[PDB]
Design a protein around this nucleic acid. Structure first.
Lengths: 122, 317, 111, 111, 110, 111
RNA sequence: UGGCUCUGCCAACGCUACGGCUUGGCGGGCUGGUGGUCAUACACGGUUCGGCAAAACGUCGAUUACUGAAAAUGGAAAGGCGGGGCCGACUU
RNA sequence: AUGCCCAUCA
């Protein structure tokens, strides 16, 4: 059969997207729980959350290190967004537990991104 | 359908089964090149696999050495979802290997229990020399064939495991099953012929509590003569001791009373492997691995060999 | 050929997925708008790729196809109400795989 | 530039009425079509200023995507929004701005 | 300098934003896009002034040119009338004033 | 300098409540203001993963645009306007971030 | 998902090409289980004790009889042999 | 096959 081969296969992008999918699968539900008002914050958070996958994916195919740093900037921004919906969203958006859960999930993707940045940097 | 089972490739390739096979094959392999390259177009991949099996054009991708590609471990999981429960149901209850709700513990517990009741005064412990590398793969397919009866499952079984050799490529899902089935033949020379009723077999190791150490020695002679003439496996170690040696069964030393466990060259090996990895010496590790795979083919190091293959990717078999 | 071929094959993706992507409820609205921008905006990615004869543009066409396959995965997840049934993911993956084949041949033809 | 935009004004003046026929159902495709249609003016303009051909090829990609939008709105959009006639007349107007874009491409890549 | 242009462009915004909020919902995409061109050209100016690449001073000009397009487009957009020709004339005067300042600034940099 | 973000996060904490206050009436201004406010964090983040002065000037441009937004939201009419107090008492906050940005620009410029 | 290129009514930040639009209210409309991670306690594990072994399960009979040229992806059974099963007791 | 931890569901 030999699975449908996409081109430009970077194990790291595949692994990192797969692990980032767990971030999305966690944070997306609580991004969608943010009320009516705080809709713009949500839409911007969702475009940061769901849009980091594209950052990783384009980094994997177009092998250029700038795109890997753009993926880090998007995650670093996702880490900011955690802080934001945690407190600044005045009607509670994320429970402190949820920030702790997601921060680790984001950090696993962080490690993989770091290793990937490093293996490319050499 | 009572013996029969003459339409399994219809159920092996039911879509809802290949999705189970897919989710089973990906259990924790979710960071292997294989999953991640398959996951991309997973359901289009399973549609070209379903329709490769549903035709009789499945051909096993090479055994990397004995790991397999994700497509294959999925085909093996899709076999061993229909084919395993029609073998693991003929496996006598006292077979404790690779069958759900039996295992390491329910075996050691059966032994201890059957040691407390019956108040055994002796025991025969035996072990098959190099079990998987000596399974007939031919009188195996006279047991995979008094049960499958479907001329297409049979040809998929024969792709996933050729009928021509003496080496079950050890450690598959199709090979755990067929080794239990295979060693189930000696269970049906213990329980059926020979009529001994206080035993346990975990893959290649076989405890046989008695009361007459001379009867055990008979049982063993009969077991060796059988497994030499009908299956083609020799007995590495055996002994007929009282239950004062404490049956060295499955990592424990099982008296009727207490149940001391045991120590671990495991640790020496794990450390040796881990060191070899973080020494750049992953080529003398294959020599060491081959060595320790001999010291442990008498033992029951399937789970451990999977485990060490999962820590990295280096195929132990 | 090539760019013409890719996109008449990709039009089938769109023709299958656009109905799916217009069914995604307003609740999943950001995901939808981004999925639709990924789906219908991949045509521009192909168009730019066959207007440069440069492989980095056909690799960012592959990235877009990969992102589209992410969207399938993701929209099959979104436990909230829902959207793409797994069959639709399977069918779309087949279609995207055909586009994948053509992209691969095109990447190779350029190589 | 100035003449490309004035000739693209005609595309917009033909197509914008067409994009406002697209019903409530396809309101999310419309916004994307309108951003492609009305947003190609910026692509032309930014190339008119900074004459780097990079900006000029993005204008070509946008015209090509606008041609895709015609095909999509004529058929793939289920109540085939643009009638085949409307696609024909729009493609004539887009072809006129296509000609000017091509001549402009050629005038820039003289050497 | 960025401060002068922005204060003069603030007058464009202060004239056009009320007008661009009156654009009917029928032409709602065009409106939101016009508003994002109108407020949003401030960022183009600001980026041009807080840095210097002259490409940023051209992107500011492109935005002013796009804003001029939006005027001519909204003038005679359809039956739900938007910016009346008078409003386009008045706005074009204000945009022309910021156009002149942008031109002088482009020149002083060049 | 990551006290930048953690000082800016009090700008956000002050401005986001009054940016979500801006009525629908001023919805495009709001969306653009929110994308300027909450999206400045990305500008800082990119600057701190590179320490290129270009990205540092882009952060300054964003602060300058945020200052514009304050003055714009002031005179936005109706009982729906950023009160003059808030303009001044956020300009103070943004000025504190401005000071640190300036020192950071200087630290980099005189290496 | 603070939506709507969505209407009716009714007001005004307003704007009008003077019809309206916008914008605000105001109505209706459309809108324990499962997964996933990770690598002699000298007293009993419900690893208890009896009864049963009819049934179902396992196995053999058996890919046999039988049917149909032919088992051809039809197909037993009496029976034997198990306990894996059953029924209580007591505990879990 | 084992537990630990975790996630969700009830």
């Amino acid at each position: 059969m030999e699975p449908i081969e996409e081109a430009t296969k970077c194990y790291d992008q595949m692994l990192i997207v797969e692990r980032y999918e767990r971030v999305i699968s966690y944070l997306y539900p609580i991004a969608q729980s943010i009320p009516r008002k705080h809709g713009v914050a949500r839409e911007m958070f969702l475009k940061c959350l769901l849009g980091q996958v594209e950052l990783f994916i384009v980094a994997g195919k177009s092998n250029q290190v700038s795109k890997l740093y753009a993926a880090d900037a998007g995650l670093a921004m996702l880490r900011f967004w955690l802080r934001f919906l945690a407190g600044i969203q005045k009607p509670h958006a994320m429970t402190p537990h949820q920030v702790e859960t997601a921060q680790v999930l984001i950090a696993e993707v962080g490690r993989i991104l770091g290793s990937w940045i490093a293996r490319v940097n050499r | 359908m009572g013996k029969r089972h003459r339409n399994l490739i219809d159920q092996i390739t039911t879509w809802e089964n290949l999705l189970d096979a897919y989710r089973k094959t990906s259990h924790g392999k979710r960071r292997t090149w294989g999953y991640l390259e398959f996951k991309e177009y997973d359901l289009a991949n399973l549609l070209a696999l379903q329709a490769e099996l549903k035709a009789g054009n499945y051909e096993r991708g090479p055994y990397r050495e004995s790991a397999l590609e994700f497509k294959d471990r999925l085909v093996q999981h899709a076999l061993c979802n229909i084919v395993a429960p029609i073998f693991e149901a003929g496996l006598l209850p006292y077979t404790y290997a690779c069958r759900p709700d039996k295992g390491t513990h329910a075996g050691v517990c059966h032994v201890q229990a059957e040691l407390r009741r019956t108040r055994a005064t002796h025991f025969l412990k035996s072990d098959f020399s190099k079990f998987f590398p000596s399974i007939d793969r031919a009188a195996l397919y006279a047991m995979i064939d008094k049960k499958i009866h479907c001329a297409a499952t049979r040809r998929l079984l024969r792709v996933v495991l050729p009928d021509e050799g003496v080496g079950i490529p050890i450690g598959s899902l199709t090979s755990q099953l067929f080794a239990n089935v295979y060693g189930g033949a000696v269970d049906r020379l213990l329980h059926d012929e020979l009529k001994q009723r206080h035993w346990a077999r975990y893959m290649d190791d076989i405890v046989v509590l008695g009361d007459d150490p001379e009867e055990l020695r008979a049982v063993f002679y009969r077991l060796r003569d059988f497994a030499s003439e009908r299956l083609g496996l020799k007995i590495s170690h055996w002994q007929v001791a009282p239950v004062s040696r404490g049956i060295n069964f499955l990592g424990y030393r099982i008296w009727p009373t207490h149940k001391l466990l045991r120590k671990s060259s495991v640790k020496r090996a794990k450390r040796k492997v881990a060191n070899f990895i973080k020494h750049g010496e992953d080529e003398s590790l294959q020599r060491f691995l081959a060595s320790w795979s001999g010291h442990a083919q008498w033992a029951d190091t399937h789970n451990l060999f999977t485990w060490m293959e999962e820590q990295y990717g280096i195929a132990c078999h």
